Design an enzyme around this catalytic site. Structure first.
Site, short mmCIF file in Angstrom:
data_model
loop_
_atom_site.label_atom_id
_atom_site.label_comp_id
_atom_site.label_asym_id
_atom_site.label_seq_id
_atom_site.Cartn_x
_atom_site.Cartn_y
_atom_site.Cartn_z
N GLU A 85 10.50 42.83 -41.34
CA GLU A 85 9.72 42.27 -40.87
C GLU A 85 9.33 41.38 -42.22
OE1 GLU A 85 9.50 42.41 -37.09
OE2 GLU A 85 9.36 40.60 -38.39
N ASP A 144 7.87 32.71 -37.95
CA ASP A 144 8.67 33.35 -37.67
C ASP A 144 10.34 32.52 -37.01
OD1 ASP A 144 8.08 34.72 -34.08
OD2 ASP A 144 8.85 32.85 -34.53
N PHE A 168 8.22 46.18 -31.01
CA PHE A 168 7.77 45.24 -31.89
C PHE A 168 8.62 44.03 -32.28
CE2 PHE A 168 4.62 45.57 -35.97
CZ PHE A 168 4.99 44.57 -36.52
N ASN A 199 27.18 47.64 -25.39
CA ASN A 199 26.04 46.62 -24.15
C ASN A 199 24.34 45.93 -24.78
OD1 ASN A 199 23.37 47.03 -22.14
ND2 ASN A 199 25.35 46.45 -20.89
#
Ligand SMILES: [Cl-]
Ligand SMILES: [Cl-]
EC number: 3.2.1.17
Length: 164
Positions: A11, A20, A104, A132
């Site tokens: 982050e 973001d 998160f 997957n």
């Protein structure tokens, strides 16, 4: 390495309101303020989160406080979620982190939607799960981060994060 160091790498840290990868107002260590397009709404949400008039900027300590709250919330959310709890409970300590990382970033609702991947993880079919997991908007939109998290699920080690 631990969940905090992991997410801090994924982050980053910014003390001023920023957008973001999806264009949403955010601050600190990936703390989403609002999906609304108004910088003012964002500023309002920030002040309410922090408990003071920030004018759009916070301190490192404030950033770390939000981060601690966020990680705690994510873990507790996973633990109350009927679909996530069993998976988390079946995993080792390193892989727990990969799951918290996804929650998160996308929220529990979003992660709870990776039904097939979740069953594979529960069954400990690591390579199958990794393939997957890669078949998703998540991988295609944030491929480098997704690769790190997926590798973590695949190997049960911190190799993807070592050297960063
Ligand atoms: Cl796809
Ligand atoms: Cl990325």
């Amino acid at each position: 390495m631990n969940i905090f160091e992991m997410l801090r790498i994924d982050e980053g840290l910014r003390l001023k309101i920023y957008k973001d990868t999806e264009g949403y107002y955010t601050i600190g260590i990936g703390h989403l303020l609002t999906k609304s397009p108004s910088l003012n709404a964002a500023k309002s949400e920030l002040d309410k989160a922090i408990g003071r008039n920030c004018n759009g900027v916070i301190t490192k300590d404030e950033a770390e406080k939000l981060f601690n709250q966020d990680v705690d919330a994510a873990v507790r959310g996973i633990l109350r979620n009927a679909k996530l709890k069993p998976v988390y409970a079946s995993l080792d300590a390193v892989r727990h982190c990969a799951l918290i990382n996804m929650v998160f970033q996308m929220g529990e609702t979003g992660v709870a939607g990776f039904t097939n991947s979740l069953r594979m993880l529960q069954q400990k079919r690591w390579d199958e799960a990794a393939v997957n997991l890669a078949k998703s908007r998540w991988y295609n939109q944030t491929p480098n981060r997704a690769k790190r998290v997926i590798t973590t699920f695949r190997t049960g080690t911190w190799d993807a994060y070592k050297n960063l």
